[PDB]
Amino acid sequence: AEKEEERQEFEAGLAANKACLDKIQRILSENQALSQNVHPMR
Amino acid sequence: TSASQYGAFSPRPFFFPCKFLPQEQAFTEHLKTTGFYQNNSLNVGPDRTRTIDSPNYQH
Amino acid sequence: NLYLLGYQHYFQSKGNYSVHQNSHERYQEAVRKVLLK
Amino acid sequence: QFRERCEELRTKLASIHEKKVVEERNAQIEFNKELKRQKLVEEHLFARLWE
Amino acid sequence: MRECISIHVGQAGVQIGNACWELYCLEHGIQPDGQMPSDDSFNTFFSETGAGKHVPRAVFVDLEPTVVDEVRTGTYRQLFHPEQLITGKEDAANNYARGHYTIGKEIVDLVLDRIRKLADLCTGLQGFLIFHSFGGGTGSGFASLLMERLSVDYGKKSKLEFAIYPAPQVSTAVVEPYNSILTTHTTLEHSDCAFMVDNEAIYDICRRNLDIERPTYTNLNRLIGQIVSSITASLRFDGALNVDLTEFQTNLVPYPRIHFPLATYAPVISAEKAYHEQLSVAEITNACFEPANQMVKCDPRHGKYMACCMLYRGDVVPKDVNAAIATIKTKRTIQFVDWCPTGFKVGINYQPPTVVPGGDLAKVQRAVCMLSNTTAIAEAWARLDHKFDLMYAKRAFVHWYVGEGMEEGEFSEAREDLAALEKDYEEVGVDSV
């Protein structure tokens, strides 16, 4: 049972890494340099 | 006149920087305009023996 | 990027909150008082 | 928080930033070209007056 | 908030102020009228009214009316408050004596009252930026006396000094060395920092790197405005290492008699040249050490650096900054005084410098300003001493100043003062090894 639990923890770590890579892809697709303020004549 | 050339520029957006992130004083300005934290109160504080406060010691 | 290792919240990965309303003083009084379901 | 906590986004932002800077510089190039054309026509008309 | 006030004096002063203020308006967003089409990053230069208007903290002063009437007529005729622009009916005509004793004293009071009002408008002020020239009679004498009175008016406040120093070969005047000798006591005992710049070096830099032939005063003024913008950018906009004026004031001056740093800007290149050049921290900081890019006709290699203040701007990284500084310190010809192994004061800013239409600088994502206090500047004063001595030997033009009404011994006094200051620079250059 102990080794089964450790194996499932390892799988959970893999899943978390996959999810963070996918959201890295999404924020790669996003594009902005606004910094909450464009120059006042733009 | 050459001096008139200094201000002969119509505004067009590509003479302007890519981003614009200035210093915003919205909070510390108020905290300046008002007085800072300070207490002129009367002496208030419980008596404490630290390690144990108020046991039930008895014979 | 020090910790983009998977976050893996420990206690979240693996009642009394209803008793003490997520208040520290209430929990201290409770654990002095038993009252933990 | 997660915007702060990634480096590869800073790399991509820098890349796209410089890429757009290039086109803005091209606009500046066209501006300089029109200025040179202006000064040339000034010289031509003054030559006409001299003649 | 941190505010600074500009006291442009003389024809050079008002032209430089015009270029600088066009730069500021274009940067912060202000229309030529003075309104915003759309935080309070302008507070250092502009004051904000209830109607939404932006008002300058700049007192243009001149003794010849025309040089300010074209300003009063031009595109920014309504941006600038007319009582800020103060004029005199007659001028000194390259006479330090006239600008110091006869003509200035009429409008001393008016200029002092206006700057008092501007400092009243300011709540916590940071510095008085002075812009003038060493050759002009007004910009020498009137400037000198306004320092003399402003020192006792505000003993503690920082008084930054930007000045046109007479070029070693080319000159726009013949009587200029007397004025340049007599002014130096003011920038010695009544100034906090000075930035003497010769037009000849800027001409060489422009025709060399910018590749623009047939320059004019506008091309120089745009670079000077870029320098002042780089100085004030850490104050106006945020940075991971922000440096106010007091920080770099402290980390440049070893002794009270030594407040004459030297300026340097990079990259200063045309757009066509910038097309084929990668511009990195190392490249720009190596270009800022070349003697051909100095804004004063002196070679720092003939002397030794005592201090260096550093202002990066744009998309800059502290890792690259440290690597560049390490390379510079490993350099051998780049020498340092024995009493300073650590001699850099680094500050960084986020926003890249803007670009003026019709100007010359192409926009570069990162840029460098250097304020190096070295001991190679004394040779310029040596050239001035030689020319002034061969002048004063035969007592030429002295009748003008005497008939104006100042005593002749002040010539010898100023000559001895500058000789002593040159000796002080030599004493600093001496190493205890």
Next chain:
Amino acid sequence: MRECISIHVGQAGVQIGNACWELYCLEHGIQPDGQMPDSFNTFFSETGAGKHVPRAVFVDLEPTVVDEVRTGTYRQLFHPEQLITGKEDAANNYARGHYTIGKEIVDLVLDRIRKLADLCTGLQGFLIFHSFGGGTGSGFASLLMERLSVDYGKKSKLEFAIYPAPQVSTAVVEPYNSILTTHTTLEHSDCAFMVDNEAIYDICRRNLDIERPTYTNLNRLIGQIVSSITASLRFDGALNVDLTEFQTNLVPYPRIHFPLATYAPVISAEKAYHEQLSVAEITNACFEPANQMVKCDPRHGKYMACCMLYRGDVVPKDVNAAIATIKTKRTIQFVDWCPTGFKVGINYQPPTVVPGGDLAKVQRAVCMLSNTTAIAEAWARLDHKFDLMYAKRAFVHWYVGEGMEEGEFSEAREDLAALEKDYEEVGVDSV
């Protein structure tokens, strides 16, 4: 990471640079604008705008030769600062380019060298190209090396130099410049690749069937020589060989850095139709005296060091077989103290071809760097011609009027006399 900077000098250097840099752009795929539509990073350099800039310094004392480049097809490829010009030239005078006109632009170049060097992280060496005949190619290049060697104590300085042809000549005072430049290529050089234009003339007319060539044909075959040397650094191979490897295994004594180059196969496409090309056939032509790139016969001398450069669909098994056959031939001699004298470098990418060129598209190639003492006879001819003129003191007033001492002429002649004497001792095979 591997980086090389070209320091081409003279009208030859610019014309060589036109052919060589055109080859590099086609080799890597660089558009005439300069945009790829990191094997290129040894020659080009990235910019912010995604533009690749050559690491070259073109210097000339006359503006017109470089002005064709400034208006050529590759105008935007080259950076304006890199191309350095001058108003007046040395005019076939060593002395003008060494004392009066050389000092005029010696310093501004060194600024550009430094900036190119600082852009590079790891520098391997400097490829320097010039001529022994012209004043700018000989006079100005001498000062630069003297300042470069004391500035860069360790970085390599290779030399592809135009040597005067034994019979034909484009100049009269050319023996004077050729003799007195030999000081620089001795104590300020690491290797040399002297070429006489005559030896290319017969090679092209015999092999490539072009009966009436031009310098562009001469320039292109020079380009293949430089490309084959650098090909190991640019691309991956089974046995990569860098500059430091073959410098070490070619110079037995520091006063001997004068080998002979040889490129093979050099055949027209139509005669390549009838010829099956293998590793053995091409490596036999690399030892043919008729295919020698310098007007001398190695059969009158002895090899002491042979450096072998292979490239293309080559196999190490067939390389070893070719070497064994070479060693079993009494026409080829080797010095006593070098029982093993070969150095094999293997590259994968075959050499490219240029439209409008002369060579055919060939799958395999071979470059040869053979040091021999039969190059000794070449400068003896130059000694004979210089002495036959210097006795009557002809053209001397030109060099004196510039301000160079007359005793340097005798000292220059003596130095090559000791040079040839040393190459006799190496030719001596003692017990």
Next chain:
Amino acid sequence: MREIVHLQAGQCGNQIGAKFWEVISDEHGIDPTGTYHGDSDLQLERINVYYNEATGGKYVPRAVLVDLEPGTMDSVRSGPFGQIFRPDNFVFGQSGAGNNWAKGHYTEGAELVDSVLDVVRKEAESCDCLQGFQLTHSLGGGTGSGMGTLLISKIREEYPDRIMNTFSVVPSPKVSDTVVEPYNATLSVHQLVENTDETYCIDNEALYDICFRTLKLTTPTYGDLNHLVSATMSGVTTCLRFPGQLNADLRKLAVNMVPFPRLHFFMPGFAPLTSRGSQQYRALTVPELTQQMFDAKNMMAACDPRHGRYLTVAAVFRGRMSMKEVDEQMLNVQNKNSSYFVEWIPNNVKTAVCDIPPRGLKMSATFIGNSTAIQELFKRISEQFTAMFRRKAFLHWYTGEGMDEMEFTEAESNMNDLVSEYQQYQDATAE
């Protein structure tokens, strides 16, 4: 109960603690607005150590942020956890120090020392049993190096028994941003020796070294650097907030780390830092933590401890480990290295265990060690401070503040006496 008041000094201090407080709120499941959404009853069991109770289920900072410049604090109260602090604890003046230690210590500090003393007294009396305070600041500025010294000296008189930590940022000679640095540093360590229970020497250049090599981060900001010192000082009080098999606190280490009152400077280090190419090829275990930690490349101070002797060593482990493997390693490092440990102190090692693993991780360790290599910093600083002071350079700035000249002389002297007696403890016979 056991409470900490987090004192904050300077732009270094504000940015360091803001990242630190970002970490701890995540350690205790606190949103940027202030409530508790977590499911860990043990996260709330000891949350009063750092936070104070507010109405509506809110928990507030027990921090006092101090600076002499208005620009830094809006950066704090606009960031990831800006709004969690309260505007009253924000204390700061109108005029900076300009990196001048004297201005923040004498001239401008005196107007602001009152108000910060007011607020910290209220955070002190708010808690029932305050364990002790805590400051993060830099020795390279004008306020943290300046005002920060003036703050500590007063509250030492006010609260003598309470422990006092300091994560002082010491300047680096290899990378320095301030010409007037040595004057501030020499005038601050004299304050640190007299009035401080506990100090950790953090050097920025070491953080730049650890990120480039072990982390292989391409472009590090100061935020990555701030995260390092936050995780370190999370690992010091981790046993205080959570239960463990063998518990400890700051005072448990404090008595166990100070053989003599003059020595309270230590070299923090972190165990589990690996790059992203190292995550796949690893197997976390108690030995691998000790291997990564004991490597002197891993330390965040600016000196190599092989040049000195380990006086006392602490290792605060965090997670679930078997203790036989814990103590056997600590004995194992003592036996193998028979030259780097002091002999008059057998069993040099203090070890503590906290069951709750670090945030985002399964195993970790934190280290506090006293070596003789700390004297390598001071004597190198004295090499620069004397070079400044022999010519009285940059002295009129400090002299005009109203101080005399003997204060410099006593500063180096006390600094010289510290390293002199520190050298003696390196060369001392136990028997």
